[PDB]
């Protein structure tokens with residue numbers, strides 16, 4: 209997260225870190241046994257880390273639970289990042305509390321202008337590299353479909369939205385991948401892609417979760 213703020217320990221209780229020996233992606237806890245992330249975060253050997261603030265220090269609220277199964281969206285296209293969503297089933301249910309909590313799926317798609325919270329442990333610079341150890345937060349609005357399509361001609365599908373600032377300076381970045389965009393207490397987006405981070409006229413692009421609720425619910429019910 210470039211141009212954000214330090215969230216504060218366990219203020220974003222649905223945020224997960226996907227760990228394969230190191231943090232490599234975020235995700236969101238949607239019930240005691242399931243995480244949603246980005247399909248581009250797929251790999252085998254995932255441990256889900258819940259209750260994290262500092263990803264390098266054991267602070268006492270963590271739960272470390274191995275993935276049993278990963279399900280990439282059947283229509284995920286790694287070239288276009290259309291359908292950039294994946295579900296991860298935990299080996300055992302998480303213990304839910306004020307610091308480890310699920311985030312509700314949306315019943316409705318959020319409109320342009322809605323303010324959202326984006327969180328992650330990604331890079332905090334738009335040029336060069338500095339990785340924070342504690343969770344960073346950014347408040348950003350959903351942009352109009354027309355602004356989003358004007359910024360990324362020929363690349364925005366109906367399964368994507370833009371959020372952020374056309375001015376630049378505030379955005380999700382490398383290592384924020386898979387993390388949540390929460391608007392009005394519902395999961396509306398997944399950190400998916402962009403052209404660099406925090407560049408002028410290049411907002412972040414997010415998976416439009418409201419289009420996937422039926423797939424999520426059906427998949428969870430049968431796995």
Ligand SMILES: COc1ccc2[nH]cc(CCN)c2c1
Nearest residue numbers: 380381382400401402404412
């Ligand atoms: C440094 O460039 C990258 C590299 C990989 C990335 N994944 C997701 C994003 C978000 C951009 N908002 C991103 C940016």
Ligand SMILES: [Ca+2]
Nearest residue numbers: 262265266267
């Ligand atoms: Ca920790």
